[PDB]
Ligand binder design. Structure first.
Ligand SMILES: CN1CCN(Cc2ccc(NCc3cccc(F)c3)cc2)CC1
Ligand SMILES: CN1CCN(Cc2ccc(NCc3cccc(F)c3)cc2)CC1
Ligand SMILES: CCCCCCCCCCCCCC(=O)O
Ligand SMILES: CCCCCCCCCCCCCC(=O)O
Lengths: 59, 178, 280, 251, 280, 251, 59
C-alpha cells in the first residue's frame, strides 16, 4: 500500500513522500497532479500531408 | 473605428514617402490593449509570470498582382522607441518579400535580465517595441485597387511557460445571477 | 515488499546557430493551410546554446481547475413567520458564479470527480432585546437526487433521510467536506448543448435541458431561539481527476442570465490615439 | 525551387522570393586573416555579431529620367551602428561585404538595372587639371547621381554616364562582379565581395575599397497606373570584420 | 529495505607548545594585504593539550533565521459606517518591523522557502449596551498575486476566490499555517537595490522597485453583530531552507522609513572619561 | 621579491615596485557566463582586447583636511573608450573589474587610506523623506566628496563620513573586499571584483553594480617640505566583458 | 520513506529519530538544520598568493 514517489523540487540545486489510501472508493483519493505529458500537434498541425518547416509551404 | 471589424486590418497604400511607418505597438502580451483579448492574452491573464519567445505572423491580403517589401523590427527595451527606419533596423529585424508565399514569421527572441516577467508589466520588466516600415513600397498594375490590408497573428513558441495562477480581472458581477 | 516506488519534462532547449545562406526559407509559410508555423528563434537569427529548466507543471488542466471556488450562498433564519424563509432549496448548477462559470466554459466537455466543502456562519439579528443564552447550533445538509420527495417545511417528515445522504455539522468545528463521483448519465459533462428538448425542435433550448443533478436542502436541526438568528452557507466545488475536450475561446461579454447565453454586444478591445502611438 | 533565398547574419535576416542565384566575388569567400600573412603585431579585435549584420541605406526613387547612382564604401557605412564606432576608434580595418539591392515592380512594368562593384574606382575631375574636395563623391550614406550631359562645374566629378567617370566604356563594366535586375524575372541582386587590396589591412577612412554602381540600361516605362516611381533600396552587411590599432577616436 | 539510515564538527583543538627561539615570527604580519592573521594562542605562549567539544551548530544561518517573527498587525471591525475600516489590505513586505528588518538586512541576497502563521484575536468594543449573544466568528484570508482584482468592500464579488488561494479559519482553534515556495522572478531575493526604475536614471530608486509580491486581504466572513467587534491579525514569517550571500555590516542608525534607507547621523559609540579609564 | 607586481590587459600594462599582494574578490576569478545559467537566447558579443583594458580616471588631491571620496561603477566608465559605446548600444551587460589605486609619498610622510568595493551601496537622502536626482551620486568619472559634518542640503545624499551614507559603522566596512594603503610600506592597492548580482546579466545604465570608496583613516601629515599635496589616481579595467541585446544607442 | 538519523546530543556522555514526508511539495518539508559545514577562507584569506603564517608577510 505504501506508495513512495518523488516530490516537486528545483533544478540542479530525500525528496520522497509516502502516500496511503484509506477509503474503498477511488473518488476519495487525492488529486493526481503529477502528470506532465502534453502534445500540441492535435491543434497546431491538423493538416493531412506532413509539412516540412524548411521547405516551402506550397509548391 | 465605427465598424468593429476594421480593428483587424492594417491599411496600406500605393504612393507613400520613401520611408514610412506602417504600425507600432508595445510588447506587453498581458497588459497592452492590442494583445489583451487575444487567445494568448486571455490565457496569460490567468497567471502572474511568463517567459519564452513569441511568434508574430503577418499575411498580405492584397491583389495577386501587387508586390512590395516590408521591414519588421523588434527593439529591446530602451529609453526611447525608434522614430525612423534608420533607428529601427539597428535591432532584430527581418525583410519580408511578398510573393507566392503570402505569410512571414517574425520570431521575437527572449531577451531579458530575469528568468520571468510580470504579466502586470512595469518599467522594471519592460519588454520593448515592435514596428513595421516600408522597405521598397507597394506597386500595382493598372486596373487594381489602390489600397490593401495586412493581418497579424500571435502565438507562443515551444519554450513558453507560465506560473503563479491568479484570478482574471476581465470578468466581474454585481449581483447573483438568476 | 510493502512499499512500491511508483516514483520531469522541461521545455525545449535552444541550440546554437551560425550564419546561413541557402535556398531554405523557414520564415516564409502560408497560413491558408490552417497550420501554425513551428519556427523557432534559432531559424531566424544566430543564437547561443541555452539549457532551459522551466517546466509547464502549473499549466496542466488538473492544476488549472484544481482550486476550490464558491458556487452559491444563501441565508436562512432559525425562526420566522414565513415558512419558506427558514430553509434553503438550491437546484445544483455551476452557472451561478461568474468566475467559476468562465473557468469551466473554456472547454466543451468535462469529466471529473468532485470535492464539496461547506462553510456555515451565524449571526444574531439586530433588535431591541438581544440578551439571551443559546447553546451551540447544529445544521443538516440534505441531498435529494432527482425525483425524490422534497420537504415543504422545516419540520417535515422528509428530513428523516433513510436513503438520501446527509451531513450533520456542529458550529465551532472544521468545515464539512465530502466527495462525489462522476454522476453523469452521458460519457461526460457538457457545458454547452446546441439543441432542443422536444423532437420537433420546440421547448427548452440550451444547457438547461441537461441539468438534472438534483437539489440540496439545509436547515437548523432543532434550534429555535427566542430571538431570530440568521445563518449563511457557502458551497465550494473542487474538481479532481479532470479531463477536458474541445477547447473554445474564452467569453468576452459579461454574463446576464444563469441559464442562458444571452449577452449584449461588446467592443473587441480598447482604443488608442493612432496606429503608431506607443507611449503611455 | 531555386528562386527563393534566405540569408541570416547576426540578428537580422533577408528573405527574397524571386531572385537569381548569388555571385561570389571572384570565387573567393570572405575569411579572416591568416597568421602567415599578417604584419601587425598586437592582437586584433573581432566584434562578430555586433558588426556583421545587415544595414539598410536610404532609399532612392527610380523615375523615367533617372540616369544612375553610385555609393562608395566603407564611407557609406562610416556612421552606422557599432561598425562606424569601430572604424572611428581603430587605425586598421579589414572586412568583406554582402550587398543586396532590392527593386520590385508589377508584371506590367519594364526596365533593366546593372548592379556592379568596382574595386579602386578612381574618378577624374569635371575640369581636367583642377581638383575636388572629399565631398563631391562621398558624404555618408547619401547617393550621388550621374548626369546625361557632360559636367561643367569644376567643384565636382565628371558625371558623364556613358564614361562612368573613369574614362572607360560603360558597356565594359561587365568584367567586374555584377548582376542584372530585369523586372521580367528578377527583383533583387546579391553580391559577396571578399576583401581586395594590395596590403593585408588598411585605414577605412582614408581609402575607398570599392564603389557600388546602379545604372539603368533600359529606362523604366509603364502606362496608365497610379504608381509614379519605383523605389530602390540597398542593404549591406560586413563579413568577417576585424580591426586593429586602438588610438583615440575621431577618425 | 523500508528505512534509509541517512544518519559532528567541533571547533579546532589546542595543541601543546613548548619554549621556542627561532627566526620564525608568527606574531608579526601586515594587514595592508587585506588578509586576517590566522595565528592561534599556541604560537605566542606555552599551552597545554585541550580537546574541545564545543560546536557551532547554533550559529548557522539556517538556525539564525529559523525563528518566527511578527511582520505586520492591523485592526478591522465587524461593523462600522466607514467601508474601508471593515477589512485590511496590506502590500507584502518585510521592512515594516524593525527586528526582522535588521536581521534580514545582514545579507545582500537571500533564497528561502517561507512558512506563514496567522494569529487572530477579537474583543468587544466599549459602549453602553454590551448585552448580546453572538456565535463564534469566522475569518477569511485572501492572497492576491500582482495584477489580480482587488476587493473594494467587505461584500465584494472578488471574495469568491476561484484561483486565488484562501484560508477560512474559525475562532477557538489552532492558528492558521501554510507554506510558500521561492517565488522570485530573479535567482534570489535582494534586500538592497542600488538603481533606478527607468532606463534614463529616473523614477523610483531603491528596493521599492523590486517589491512585487502582491497583497493580502482579510475580512469577517459573514459576522455582523448588533454592536461593533474589533479583530486584530498578526502575521509571522519563518524562513526555511535558507541560503545567503555577500554579508554586510549591521545597521547602526535607527530606521525611519518603511521603503527607504534614510537615516540621521549617529555617534560611532558611547564615551568614557579618558583613554585609560577602566573602572565602572 | 614579492613586492613587485605586473599586470597586462589588452594593450596596456601596470607596473608597481612597492605593493602588497592582490585581493581576489570573494576568492572567485572573473569568468564568462556558462551555457547552463544563461537566459538570453541570441548570441552574445565578446569584444575582448578592445574593451578589457586599463582606463585612468581623473586624479584627486589629498590634502590635510580631506575626508574621503567615492565612485559608482560602471557609470564612471560610461563614457570611456569602446566600453562606453558598447554600454550605450546594448541592453544587457556583464563584466568583472580590476581596480588599481595609486598613491606614492616619501618616507617622511604618514597616513593611511582604506580602499574598499561595496556591492549594492544604496544611499539615503540628506533629508529623510525627500528624494534626489541621479546627479548627487554619479555624474561620470568625477569623484564625490564625503563631509565631516552632517549634510543639510535636501538635493544631495547624506555625506556623514562616520556613517558612510549607508547608516552603518564606518569601521565595519572591513567585511567587504578591501586593502589598506599605508605610506610606511605600501604605494598601491589592487582588487579583483567578479560579477556579483542576483541575475545573470543587467542593464549597465540603470543599476550600479558596486561602489568604490577611499577614506583616510589617518589624516595626512608632513613637515617643512615643498610638496603641498599627495595626488591619488584610480585605474580600472573590465574583465571578461560581454554584451547582448543590440538596440539603438542613446542609453 | 522512513528516514532515520541521529539527533543532537552531548559529548562523551538510542539517539535516533524517524521522519516521513506527507506532502508532494519539497517546500512543505521541515527545516534542514542539521548541516554544520563551514569555510571562512572566502572572507579571511581572499589574497591571490598563499601566505604562510610562520614566514614574514612581506619579503
Ligand atoms: C449542464 N451541465 C451540468 C453539469 N455542469 C458541470 C457540473 C457542475 C457541478 C456538478 N456537481 C455534481 C455534484 C457533486 C456533488 C454533490 C452534488 F449534489 C452534485 C456536476 C456537473 C456542466 C453543465
Ligand atoms: C525587495 N525584496 C522583497 C522581498 N524581501 C524578502 C521577502 C520577504 C517576504 C517575502 N514573502 C513572500 C510571501 C510568502 C508567503 C505568502 C506571501 F503572500 C508572500 C518574500 C521576500 C526582500 C526585499
Ligand atoms: C484504513 C487504513 C489504516 C492504515 C493505518 C496506517 C498504516 C499502518 C500500516 C503500516 C503501513 C503499511 C501499509 C501497507 O502494507 O501497504
Ligand atoms: C500520506 C502518508 C501517510 C503515512 C502514514 C504513516 C506511515 C504508514 C506506513 C508505515 C511507514 C512506512 C513508510 C515507507 O514505506 O516509507
Amino acid at each position: 500500500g505504501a506508495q513512495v514517489s518523488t516530490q516537486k523540487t528545483g533544478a540542479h540545486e530525500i525528496i520522497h513522500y509516502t502516500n496511503i489510501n484509506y477509503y474503498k472508493d477511488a473518488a476519495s483519493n487525492s488529486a493526481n497532479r503529477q502528470d506532465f505529458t502534453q502534445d500540441p500537434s492535435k491543434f497546431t498541425e491538423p493538416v493531412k500531408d506532413v509539412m516540412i518547416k524548411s521547405l516551402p509551404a506550397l509548391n | 473605428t465605427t465598424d468593429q471589424m476594421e480593428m483587424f486590418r492594417i491599411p496600406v497604400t500605393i504612393n507613400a514617402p520613401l520611408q514610412q511607418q506602417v504600425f507600432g505597438l508595445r510588447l506587453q502580451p498581458g497588459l497592452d490593449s492590442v494583445f489583451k483579448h487575444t487567445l494568448l492574452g486571455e490565457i496569460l491573464n490567468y497567471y502572474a509570470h511568463w517567459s519564452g519567445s513569441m511568434k508574430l505572423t503577418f499575411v498580405f491580403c492584397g491583389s495577386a498582382m501587387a508586390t512590395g517589401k516590408f521591414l519588421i523590427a523588434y527593439s529591446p527595451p530602451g529609453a526611447n522607441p525608434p522614430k525612423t527606419r534608420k533607428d529601427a533596423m539597428l535591432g532584430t529585424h527581418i525583410i519580408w518579400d511578398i510573393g507566392l508565399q503570402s505569410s512571414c514569421v517574425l520570431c521575437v527572441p527572449w531577451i531579458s535580465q530575469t528568468h520571468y516577467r510580470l504579466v502586470q508589466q512595469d518599467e522594471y520588466t519592460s519588454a520593448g517595441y515592435v514596428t513595421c516600415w516600408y522597405q521598397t513600397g507597394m506597386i500595382v498594375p493598372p486596373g487594381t485597387p489602390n489600397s490593401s490590408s495586412i493581418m497579424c497573428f500571435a502565438s507562443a513558441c515551444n519554450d513558453f511557460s507560465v506560473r503563479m495562477l491568479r484570478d482574471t480581472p476581465f470578468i466581474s458581477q454585481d449581483n447573483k445571477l438568476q | 515488499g510493502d512499499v512500491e516506488e511508483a516514483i520531469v519534462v522541461h521545455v525545449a532547449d535552444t541550440m546554437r546557430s551560425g550564419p546561413s545562406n541557402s535556398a531554405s526559407v523557414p520564415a516564409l509559410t502560408a497560413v491558408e493551410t490552417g497550420h501554425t508555423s513551428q519556427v523557432t528563434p534559432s531559424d531566424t537569427m544566430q543564437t547561443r546554446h541555452v539549457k532551459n529548466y522551466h517546466s509547464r507543471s502549473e499549466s496542466t488542466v488538473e492544476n488549472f481547475l484544481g482550486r476550490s471556488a464558491c458556487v452559491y450562498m444563501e441565508e436562512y433564519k432559525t425562526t420566522d413567520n414565513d415558512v419558506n424563509k427558514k430553509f434553503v432549496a438550491w437546484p445544483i448548477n455551476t452557472k451561478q458564479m461568474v468566475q467559476m462559470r468562465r473557468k469551466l466554459e473554456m472547454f466543451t466537455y468535462l469529466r471529473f470527480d468532485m470535492e464539496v466543502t461547506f462553510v456555515i456562519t451565524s449571526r444574531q439579528d439586530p433588535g431591541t432585546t438581544l440578551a439571551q443564552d443559546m447553546p451551540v447550533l447544529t445544521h443538516q445538509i440534505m441531498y435529494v437526487p432527482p425525483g425524490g420527495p422534497i420537504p415543504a417545511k422545516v419540520d417535515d417528515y422528509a428530513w428523516q433521510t433513510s436513503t438520501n445522504p446527509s451531513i450533520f455539522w456542529t458550529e465551532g468545528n472544521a468545515p464539512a467536506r465530502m466527495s462525489i463521483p462522476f454522476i453523469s448519465i452521458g460519457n461526460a459533462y457538457s457545458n454547452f448543448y446546441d439543441g432542443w428538448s422536444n423532437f420537433d425542435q420546440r421547448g427548452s433550448y440550451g444547457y438547461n435541458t441537461l441539468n438534472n443533478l438534483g437539489h440540496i436542502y439545509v436547515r437548523h436541526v432543532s434550534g429555535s431561539s427566542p430571538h431570530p438568528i440568521t445563518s449563511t452557507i457557502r458551497v465550494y466545488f473542487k474538481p479532481k481527476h479532470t479531463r477536458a475536450w474541445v477547447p473554445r475561446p474564452p467569453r468576452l461579454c459579461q454574463y446576464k442570465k444563469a441559464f442562458s447565453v444571452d449577452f449584449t454586444p461588446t467592443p473587441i478591445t480598447d482604443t488608442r490615439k493612432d496606429i503608431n502611438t506607443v507611449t503611455t | 525551387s531555386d528562386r527563393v533565398r534566405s540569408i541570416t547574419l547576426g540578428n537580422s535576416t533577408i528573405t527574397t522570393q524571386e531572385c537569381a542565384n548569388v555571385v561570389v566575388g571572384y570565387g573567393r569567400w570572405p575569411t579572416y586573416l591568416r597568421d602567415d600573412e599578417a604584419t601587425a603585431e598586437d592582437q586584433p579585435t573581432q566584434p562578430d555579431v555586433a558588426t556583421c549584420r545587415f544595414y539598410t541605406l536610404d532609399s532612392i526613387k527610380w523615375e523615367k529620367g533617372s540616369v544612375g547612382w553610385w555609393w562608395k564604401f566603407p564611407e557609406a557605412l562610416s556612421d552606422m551602428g557599432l561598425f562606424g564606432q569601430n572604424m572611428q576608434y581603430h587605425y586598421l580595418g579589414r572586412a568583406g561585404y554582402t550587398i543586396h539591392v532590392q527593386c520590385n515592380a508589377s508584371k506590367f512594368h519594364q526596365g533593366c538595372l546593372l548592379v556592379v562593384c568596382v574595386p579602386e574606382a578612381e574618378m577624374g575631375g569635371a575640369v581636367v587639371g583642377q581638383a575636388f574636395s572629399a565631398t563631391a563623391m562621398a558624404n555618408g550614406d547619401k547617393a550621388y547621381e550621374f548626369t546625361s550631359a557632360t559636367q561643367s562645374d569644376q567643384t565636382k566629378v565628371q558625371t558623364a554616364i556613358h564614361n562612368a567617370g573613369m574614362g572607360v566604356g560603360v558597356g565594359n563594366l561587365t568584367i567586374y562582379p555584377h548582376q542584372w535586375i530585369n523586372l521580367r524575372t528578377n527583383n533583387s541582386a546579391t553580391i559577396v565581395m571578399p576583401y581586395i587590396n594590395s596590403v593585408p589591412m588598411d585605414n577605412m577612412f582614408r581609402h575607398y575599397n570599392f564603389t557600388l554602381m546602379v545604372i539603368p540600361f533600359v529606362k523604366l516605362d509603364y502606362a496608365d497606373t497610379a504608381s509614379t516611381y519605383v523605389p530602390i533600396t540597398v542593404t549591406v552587411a560586413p563579413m568577417c570584420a576585424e580591426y586593429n590599432g586602438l588610438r583615440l577616436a575621431q577618425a
